[PDB]
Design an enzyme around this catalytic site. Structure first.
Site, PDB file in Angstrom:
ATOM      1  N   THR A 160       3.747  11.886  -8.122  1.00 22.14           N
ATOM      2  CA  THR A 160       4.880  11.623  -9.009  1.00 22.14           C
ATOM      3  C   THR A 160       5.042  10.117  -9.282  1.00 22.14           C
ATOM      4  OG1 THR A 160       6.574  11.519  -7.248  1.00 22.14           O
ATOM      5  CG2 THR A 160       6.029  13.698  -8.087  1.00 22.14           C
ATOM      6  N   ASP A 192       2.541   1.779  -3.476  1.00 21.71           N
ATOM      7  CA  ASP A 192       1.390   2.185  -4.314  1.00 21.71           C
ATOM      8  C   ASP A 192       1.083   3.670  -4.273  1.00 21.71           C
ATOM      9  OD1 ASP A 192      -1.659   2.743  -4.770  1.00 21.71           O
ATOM     10  OD2 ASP A 192      -1.407   0.734  -5.568  1.00 21.71           O
ATOM     11  N   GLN A 196       0.827  -1.201   0.000  1.00 25.21           N
ATOM     12  CA  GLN A 196       0.000   0.000   0.000  1.00 25.21           C
ATOM     13  C   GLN A 196       0.869   1.263   0.000  1.00 25.21           C
ATOM     14  OE1 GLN A 196      -2.589   0.657   3.383  1.00 25.21           O
ATOM     15  NE2 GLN A 196      -4.261   1.427   2.081  1.00 25.21           N
ATOM     16  N   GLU A 206      -6.311   6.602   6.061  1.00 23.62           N
ATOM     17  CA  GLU A 206      -7.337   5.650   5.573  1.00 23.62           C
ATOM     18  C   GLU A 206      -7.537   4.475   6.512  1.00 23.62           C
ATOM     19  OE1 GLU A 206      -6.599   2.512   3.813  1.00 23.62           O
ATOM     20  OE2 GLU A 206      -8.728   1.971   3.507  1.00 23.62           O
ATOM     21  N   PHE A 266       7.804   8.498 -10.016  1.00 30.63           N
ATOM     22  CA  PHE A 266       9.076   7.962  -9.520  1.00 30.63           C
ATOM     23  C   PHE A 266       8.936   7.423  -8.101  1.00 30.63           C
ATOM     24  CE2 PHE A 266       9.908  11.660 -12.305  1.00 30.63           C
ATOM     25  CZ  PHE A 266      10.387  10.955 -13.403  1.00 30.63           C
ATOM     26  N   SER A 281       7.407  10.516  -2.209  1.00 31.41           N
ATOM     27  CA  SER A 281       6.503  11.642  -2.355  1.00 31.41           C
ATOM     28  C   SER A 281       5.323  11.507  -1.395  1.00 31.41           C
ATOM     29  CB  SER A 281       5.984  11.720  -3.794  1.00 31.41           C
ATOM     30  OG  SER A 281       5.313  10.523  -4.142  1.00 31.41           O
ATOM     31  N   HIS A 293      -5.576  -5.768  -2.329  1.00 28.21           N
ATOM     32  CA  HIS A 293      -6.851  -5.774  -1.615  1.00 28.21           C
ATOM     33  C   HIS A 293      -7.270  -7.194  -1.220  1.00 28.21           C
ATOM     34  CE1 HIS A 293      -7.774  -1.470  -3.595  1.00 28.21           C
ATOM     35  NE2 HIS A 293      -6.914  -1.353  -2.598  1.00 28.21           N
ATOM     36  N   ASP A 311       2.835   5.947  -3.214  1.00 26.75           N
ATOM     37  CA  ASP A 311       3.978   6.748  -3.611  1.00 26.75           C
ATOM     38  C   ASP A 311       3.926   6.873  -5.139  1.00 26.75           C
ATOM     39  OD1 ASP A 311       6.659   7.314  -4.616  1.00 26.75           O
ATOM     40  OD2 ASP A 311       7.362   7.041  -2.579  1.00 26.75           O
ATOM     41  N   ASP A 319       9.846   7.896  -4.925  1.00 25.58           N
ATOM     42  CA  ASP A 319      10.713   8.911  -4.351  1.00 25.58           C
ATOM     43  C   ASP A 319      10.231   9.440  -3.029  1.00 25.58           C
ATOM     44  OD1 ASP A 319       8.477  10.171  -5.058  1.00 25.58           O
ATOM     45  OD2 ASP A 319       9.376  11.609  -6.475  1.00 25.58           O
TER      46      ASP A 319
HETATM   47  C1  HEM Z   1      -8.819   0.431   3.437  1.00 21.28           C
HETATM   48  C2  HEM Z   1      -7.837   0.004   2.313  1.00 21.28           C
HETATM   49  C3  HEM Z   1      -6.782  -0.836   2.417  1.00 21.28           C
HETATM   50  C4  HEM Z   1      -6.330  -1.684   3.641  1.00 21.28           C
HETATM   51  C5  HEM Z   1      -7.154  -1.775   4.750  1.00 21.28           C
HETATM   52  C6  HEM Z   1      -6.117  -0.875   1.136  1.00 21.28           C
HETATM   53  C7  HEM Z   1      -5.000  -1.674   0.815  1.00 21.28           C
HETATM   54  C8  HEM Z   1      -4.218  -1.804  -0.337  1.00 21.28           C
HETATM   55  C9  HEM Z   1      -3.067  -2.751  -0.603  1.00 21.28           C
HETATM   56  C10 HEM Z   1      -2.439  -3.671   0.507  1.00 21.28           C
HETATM   57  C11 HEM Z   1      -2.542  -2.424  -1.857  1.00 21.28           C
HETATM   58  C12 HEM Z   1      -1.347  -2.954  -2.743  1.00 21.28           C
HETATM   59  C13 HEM Z   1      -0.358  -3.817  -2.342  1.00 21.28           C
HETATM   60  C14 HEM Z   1      -3.474  -1.425  -2.345  1.00 21.28           C
HETATM   61  C15 HEM Z   1      -3.395  -0.874  -3.546  1.00 21.28           C
HETATM   62  C16 HEM Z   1      -4.166   0.115  -4.001  1.00 21.28           C
HETATM   63  N1  HEM Z   1      -5.302   0.658  -3.418  1.00 21.28           N
HETATM   64 FE1  HEM Z   1      -6.185   0.383  -1.574  1.00 21.28          FE
HETATM   65  N2  HEM Z   1      -6.766   0.005   0.282  1.00 21.28           N
HETATM   66  C17 HEM Z   1      -7.841   0.558   0.945  1.00 21.28           C
HETATM   67  C18 HEM Z   1      -8.712   1.487   0.367  1.00 21.28           C
HETATM   68  C19 HEM Z   1      -8.589   1.954  -0.945  1.00 21.28           C
HETATM   69  C20 HEM Z   1      -9.541   2.844  -1.590  1.00 21.28           C
HETATM   70  C21 HEM Z   1     -10.889   3.216  -0.917  1.00 21.28           C
HETATM   71  C22 HEM Z   1      -9.109   3.048  -2.862  1.00 21.28           C
HETATM   72  C23 HEM Z   1      -9.792   3.909  -3.931  1.00 21.28           C
HETATM   73  C24 HEM Z   1     -10.723   3.067  -4.749  1.00 21.28           C
HETATM   74  C25 HEM Z   1     -11.350   3.923  -5.807  1.00 21.28           C
HETATM   75  O1  HEM Z   1     -11.206   3.539  -6.958  1.00 21.28           O
HETATM   76  O2  HEM Z   1     -12.080   4.938  -5.526  1.00 21.28           O
HETATM   77  C26 HEM Z   1      -7.848   2.320  -3.009  1.00 21.28           C
HETATM   78  C27 HEM Z   1      -6.973   2.371  -4.079  1.00 21.28           C
HETATM   79  C28 HEM Z   1      -5.806   1.637  -4.254  1.00 21.28           C
HETATM   80  C29 HEM Z   1      -4.997   1.792  -5.442  1.00 21.28           C
HETATM   81  C30 HEM Z   1      -5.315   2.834  -6.594  1.00 21.28           C
HETATM   82  C31 HEM Z   1      -4.873   4.307  -6.310  1.00 21.28           C
HETATM   83  C32 HEM Z   1      -4.936   5.283  -7.434  1.00 21.28           C
HETATM   84  O3  HEM Z   1      -4.111   5.153  -8.344  1.00 21.28           O
HETATM   85  O4  HEM Z   1      -5.821   6.155  -7.458  1.00 21.28           O
HETATM   86  C33 HEM Z   1      -3.922   0.736  -5.274  1.00 21.28           C
HETATM   87  C34 HEM Z   1      -2.727   0.402  -6.174  1.00 21.28           C
HETATM   88  N3  HEM Z   1      -7.543   1.657  -1.843  1.00 21.28           N
HETATM   89  N4  HEM Z   1      -4.486  -1.020  -1.479  1.00 21.28           N
HETATM   90 CA   LIG Z   2       6.377   9.145  -6.141  1.00 22.70          CA
END
Ligand code: HEM
Ligand SMILES: [Ca+2]
Ligand SMILES: *[C@@H]1O[C@H](CO)[C@@H](O[C@@H]2O[C@H](CO)[C@@H](O[C@H]3O[C@H](CO)[C@@H](O)[C@H](O)[C@@H]3O)[C@H](O)[C@H]2NC(C)=O)[C@H](O)[C@H]1NC(C)=O
Ligand SMILES: *[C@@H]1O[C@H](CO)[C@@H](O[C@@H]2O[C@H](CO)[C@@H](O[C@H]3O[C@H](CO)[C@@H](O)[C@H](O)[C@@H]3O)[C@H](O)[C@H]2NC(C)=O)[C@H](O)[C@H]1NC(C)=O
Ligand SMILES: *[C@@H]1O[C@H](CO)[C@@H](O[C@@H]2O[C@H](CO)[C@@H](O)[C@H](O)[C@H]2NC(C)=O)[C@H](O)[C@H]1NC(C)=O
Ligand SMILES: *[C@@H]1O[C@H](CO)[C@@H](O[C@H]2O[C@H](CO)[C@@H](O)[C@H](O)[C@H]2NC(C)=O)[C@H](O)[C@H]1NC(C)=O
EC number: 1.11.1.7
Length: 595
Positions: A184, A108, A105, A258, A186, A190, A351, A110, A188
Site C-alpha cells: 500500500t 521505504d 529502510q 534481509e 499510504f 503495512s 544504500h 512500508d 500505514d
Molecule cells: C541489504 C540491504 C540494506 C541494508 C543492509 C538496504 C538498505 C536500504 C536503506 C537504508 C534504504 C532507504 C533509506 C533503502 C531503500 C530501498 N531499498 Fe534496500 N537495502 C538492502 C537490500 C535491498 C535489495 C536487495 C533491494 C532490491 C533491489 C532490486 O532492485 O532487486 C532493495 C530495494 C530498496 C528499495 C526499492 C524497493 C521496491 O520498491 O521494490 C528502497 C527504497 N534493497 N534500502
Molecule cells: Ca503502506
C-alpha cells in the site's frame, strides 16, 4: 479522481464508508476512486516510460540500439568505476546515528515493493539465467566487464530478473509496461500488518480475543516476544548456516529478514502492537478481538507517520523541507497518493548510508563479547545471531550508539553491498546492490537525469563543464561523461545521488524534490492521516505528539538508558538519560465509557 481501466489484481473489495479503520489492501481510502493507493496496482508514472522499443524492452537489451546515439554503459562497470571504494576510514556520519539509515529502510518498505517476475519454482530457466547468462524474456543478466575480478572467480554474469508488471506474469500486454507495487502507498504500518487479507490473517493470534499478533513459541528474549518463523522450507536463513538451522522471520512484509537490523526493527514494532493491545484491554475490558486489533493498529500507524514526518524527513530534506512539504492544511481528495515509479529509485539513496559493520554492545554500551563488531555481509538473512546470540538488545544499543555511513562522492557504496550481497534465491555472497539498482533503473524504463532535472525546475547540464558545476566535482564529472557520453543518459539513481547535499540535509536538489513531492502527496492524499480531523480526537492527538523512538525502546526492551534524540549522533553516557525521564504515552484518551 482516478482508480482504473485495465486492473485485474485483488479481487472483490466492497466497502463500508462508515468504517473508522483502514482496509488492509489500501482500498477505499479515496471514496471517489476506491483503488487509488491500494496494493497490487501499477506504480504511478509522473513521466512517460522510456524503453528501447518504446513499450517494454529496457535500454541495453539490444546490443546495437543506442540511447540518444550512445551505448549505455554496463551496470557493473558504472559500479566499479564510480560507486566502489576500498578505505572505510573517515566514512561515518558525525551527526546521524545508525537508526537514521535504519528508519529509512522501514518507511521505504512500508511504501513500495516491486517484486521479481516469479514465474515458477518449476522453471529450469532460473538456472538457464544463472548458469549460462543467456538474455531472454525475464532474464536480463548483469554482464561482467573485462578486468572485473569477479570474472575470474564467479562466472560471466550476475543473475537478474525483470520486475513484475500489471496485467500478467508470463507474456505481455498492450500499451506500455507498468511495474506493480505489491504494498500500500499510504504510510500505514503495512510492513507490520501485511498488505493482503491472506497474510494479515496468518499474522494474527485468533485463538485469544486479545487482538494480539502471533509470536514465536520456540524462543523468547528474556521473556519478550520474537516474530514467528516462516513456513517455506527452502529457507535462506537456514542456508547461511545449516548448523544453527534457524529460519527467517514471518512478518507483514517479505523482506523483514534481509538484514539483522531490519528484523530487529520489525520485532520492536510487533512488540509495540501487542503491548498497546494489552493495555487497551485494561482500559476497555469490553472491547472484542477485532476492536483491540484495529485500534492498536491505528495507533502504530500514526506513530510511524509521526516519527517519519516530525523527526526523520527534516534531517533528510534539510532546508528544502518546507519548500516541498508545507504545513498540513487537511485531507485533499484531489491528490494522487500513489507511489511513483521514480520514487522507488530516489529512496534508494539510503544504500549510500549503510556502513560496513554492525556492533553488539553490552549493558554499559561496551563491546558485547569477542567478536562484537561484524562485517555487514555476514548478516544478510541472518536470524540465528538474534536467536542464538543475545536477543535484540545488543543490536538495539548499536543502533543508538553507532553512526550511519555518510554519503561521499568518492566513497559511495560499501563493498559489503557492492560485492558481497546475498540474494535469497541464489547461493553466494557476491552480488552487487549498486549494479542491480542501475539494471532495475533500466528495467523500469526510467527517463534520464536531465528529464528529472527538468521536471524539478533545475538546470540541465549538456556538457562536461556544465556537469562539473552542478556536481561541484571535476573528477566524478569526468568519470560520468566517459561512461555516459551525455548527461541525458545518466541513470537517475547514480545522477541523483552524485549531487552535493542540500544544507542540513542528506540528499541533493534533485532527490529532495522527488522525495519531497512524493511525501507531500501521501500525507495530503491520505484520508486517515493522523491529523485529519475526525480520525483521532484532539485529546488523542495531544496524546499522539509525545511519541518518540526512544520511548519505544524503553517499553519494548530491557534497555534503561536511551538518547532523547535518537536520530542524531549520541555519545555514551553524556547524551543518554534514564528511561523513566522519557515522556510516556498517555492512553487515557482511548478509554470508552457506555454513557
Ligand atoms: C541489504 C540491504 C540494506 C541494508 C543492509 C538496504 C538498505 C536500504 C536503506 C537504508 C534504504 C532507504 C533509506 C533503502 C531503500 C530501498 N531499498 Fe534496500 N537495502 C538492502 C537490500 C535491498 C535489495 C536487495 C533491494 C532490491 C533491489 C532490486 O532492485 O532487486 C532493495 C530495494 C530498496 C528499495 C526499492 C524497493 C521496491 O520498491 O521494490 C528502497 C527504497 N534493497 N534500502
Ligand atoms: Ca503502506
Ligand atoms: C545534529 O543534528 C541536529 C538536528 O539535525 C542539529 O540541531 C537542530 O538544530 C535545529 C535548528 O537548526 C533545532 O530545531 C528546532 O528548534 C526549535 C527549538 O526551540 C524548535 O521549536 C523548532 O521546531 C525547530 O525544529 C534543534 O535544536 C536541533 N534538532 C535536534 C534534533 O536536536 C545539530 O546542530 C547537529 N549537530 C551538529 C554539531 O551539527
Ligand atoms: C553457525 O551457528 C552456530 C550456532 O548454532 C555457531 O556456533 C556457535 O557460536 C560459537 C562458536 O564459535 C559458540 O560460542 C561460544 O560458546 C561458549 C561461550 O558462551 C564457549 O564455551 C565456546 O567456546 C563458544 O566459542 C557457540 O556455543 C556455538 N554453538 C554451537 C552449537 O556450536 C557457528 O559459529 C555458526 N557458523 C557459521 C558459519 O556462522
Ligand atoms: C496467543 O495469545 C495467547 C495469550 O492471549 C498466548 O497464550 C499464552 O502463552 C504464554 C506463553 O506460551 C503463556 O503465558 C500461556 O500458555 C498462555 N496464556 C494464556 C492466557 O492462555 C498464545 O501463546 C498466543 N499464540 C500465539 C501463536 O501467539
Ligand atoms: C488539492 O490538490 C489539488 C491537486 O494538486 C490542488 O489543485 C490546485 O493545483 C492544481 C495543480 O496541481 C490545479 O488543479 C489547480 O491550480 C488547483 N486546483 C484547485 C482545486 O484550485 C488543490 O489546490 C488542493 N486543494 C486545496 C483546496 O488546497
Amino acid at each position: 479522481s482516478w482508480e482504473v481501466g485495465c486492473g485485474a489484481p485483488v479481487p472483490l473489495v466492497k466497502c463500508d464508508e462508515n468504517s473508522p479503520y483502514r482496509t488492509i489492501t489500501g482500498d477505499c481510502n479515496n471514496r471517489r476512486s476506491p483503488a487509488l493507493g491500494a496494493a497490487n496496482r501499477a506504480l504511478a508514472r509522473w513521466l512517460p516510460a522510456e524503453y528501447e522499443d518504446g513499450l517494454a524492452l529496457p535500454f541495453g537489451w539490444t546490443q546495437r540500439k543506442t540511447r540518444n546515439g550512445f551505448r549505455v554503459p554496463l551496470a557493473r562497470e558504472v559500479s566499479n568505476k564510480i560507486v566502489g571504494y576500498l578505505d572505510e576510514e573517515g566514512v561515518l556520519d558525525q551527526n546521524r546515528s545508525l537508526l537514521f539509515m535504519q528508519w529509512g529502510q522501514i518507511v521505504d518498505h512500508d511504501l513500495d515493493f516491486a517484486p521479481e517476475t516469479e514465474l515458477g519454482s518449476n522453471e529450469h530457466s532460473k538456472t538457464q539465467c544463472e548458469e549460462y547468462c543467456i538474455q531472454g524474456d525475464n532474464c536480463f543478466p548483469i554482464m561482467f566487464p573485462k578486468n572485473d575480478p569477479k570474472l575470474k572467480t564467479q562466472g560471466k554474469c550476475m543473475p537478474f530478473f525483470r520486475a513484475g508488471f500489471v496485467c500478467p506474469t508470463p507474456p505481455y500486454q498492450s500499451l506500455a509496461r507498468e511495474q506493480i507495487n505489491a504494498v500500500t502507498s499510504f504510510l500505514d504500518a503495512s510492513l507490520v500488518y501485511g498488505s493482503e487479507p491472506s497474510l494479515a490473517s496468518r499474522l494474527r493470534n485468533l485463538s485469544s480475543p486479545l487482538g494480539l499478533m502471533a509470536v514465536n513459541q520456540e524462543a523468547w528474549d528474556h521473556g519478550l516476544a520474537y516474530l514467528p518463523f516462516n513456513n517455506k522450507k527452502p529457507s535462506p536463513c537456514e542456508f547461511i548456516n545449516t548448523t544453527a538451522r534457524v529460519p527467517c522471520f514471518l512478518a507483514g512484509d517479505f523482506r523483514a529478514s534481509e538484514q539483522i537490523l531490519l528484523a530487529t526493527a520489525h520485532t520492536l514494532l510487533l512488540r509495540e502492537h501487542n503491548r498497546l493491545a494489552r493495555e487497551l484491554k485494561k482500559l476497555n475490558p469490553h472491547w472484542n478481538g477485532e476492536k483491540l486489533y484495529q485500534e492498536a493498529r491505528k495507533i502504530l500507524g500514526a506513530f510511524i507517520q509521526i516519527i517519519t514526518f516530525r523527526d526523520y524527513l527534516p534531517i533528510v530534506l534539510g532546508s528544502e523541507m518546507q519548500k516541498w512539504i508545507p504545513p498540513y492544511q487537511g485531507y485533499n481528495n484531489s491528490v494522487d497518493p500513489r507511489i511513483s515509479n521514480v520514487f522507488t529509485f530516489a529512496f534508494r539513496f539510503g544504500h549510500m548510508e549503510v556502513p560496513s559493520t554492525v556492533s553488539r554492545l553490552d549493558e554499559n554500551y561496551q563491546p558485547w563479547g569477542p567478536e562484537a563488531e561484524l562485517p555487514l555481509h555476514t548478516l544478510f538473512f541472518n536470524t540465528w545471531r538474534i536467536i542464538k546470540d543475545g536477543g535484540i538488545d545488543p543490536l538495539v544499543r548499536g543502533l543508538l550508539a553507532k553512526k550511519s555511513k555518510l554519503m561521499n562522492q568518492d566513497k559511495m557504496v560499501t563493498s559489503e553491498l557492492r560485492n558481497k550481497l546475498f540474494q535469497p534465491t541464489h547461493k553466494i555472497h557476491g552480488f552487487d546492490l549498486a549494479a542491480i539498482n542501475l539494471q532495475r533503473c533500466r528495467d523500469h524504463g526510467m527517463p534520464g537525469y536531465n528529464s528529472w532535472r527538468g521536471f524539478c525546475g533545475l538546470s540541465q547540464p549538456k556538457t562536461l563543464k556544465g556537469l562539473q558545476t552542478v556536481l561541484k566535482n571535476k573528477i566524478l564529472a569526468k568519470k560520468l561523461m566517459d561512461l555516459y557520453k551525455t548527461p541525458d543518459n545518466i541513470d537517475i539513481w547514480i545522477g541523483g545521488n552524485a549531487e552535493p547535499m542540500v544544507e542540513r540535509g542528506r540528499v541533493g536538489p534533485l532527490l529532495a524534490c522527488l522525495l519531497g513531492r512524493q511525501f507531500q502527496q501521501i500525507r495530503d492524499g491520505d484520508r486517515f492521516w493522523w491529523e485529519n480531523p475526525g480520525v483521532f480526537t484532539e485529546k488523542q492527538r495531544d496524546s499522539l505528539q509525545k511519541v518518540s523512538f526512544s520511548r519505544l525502546i524503553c517499553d519494548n526492551t530491557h534497555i534503561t538508558k536511551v538518547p532523547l534524540h535518537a536520530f542524531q549522533a549520541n555519545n555514551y553516557p553524556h547524551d543518554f538519560v534514564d528511561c523513566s525521564t522519557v515522556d510516556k504515552l498517555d492512553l487515557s484518551p482511548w478509554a470508552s465509557r457506555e454513557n
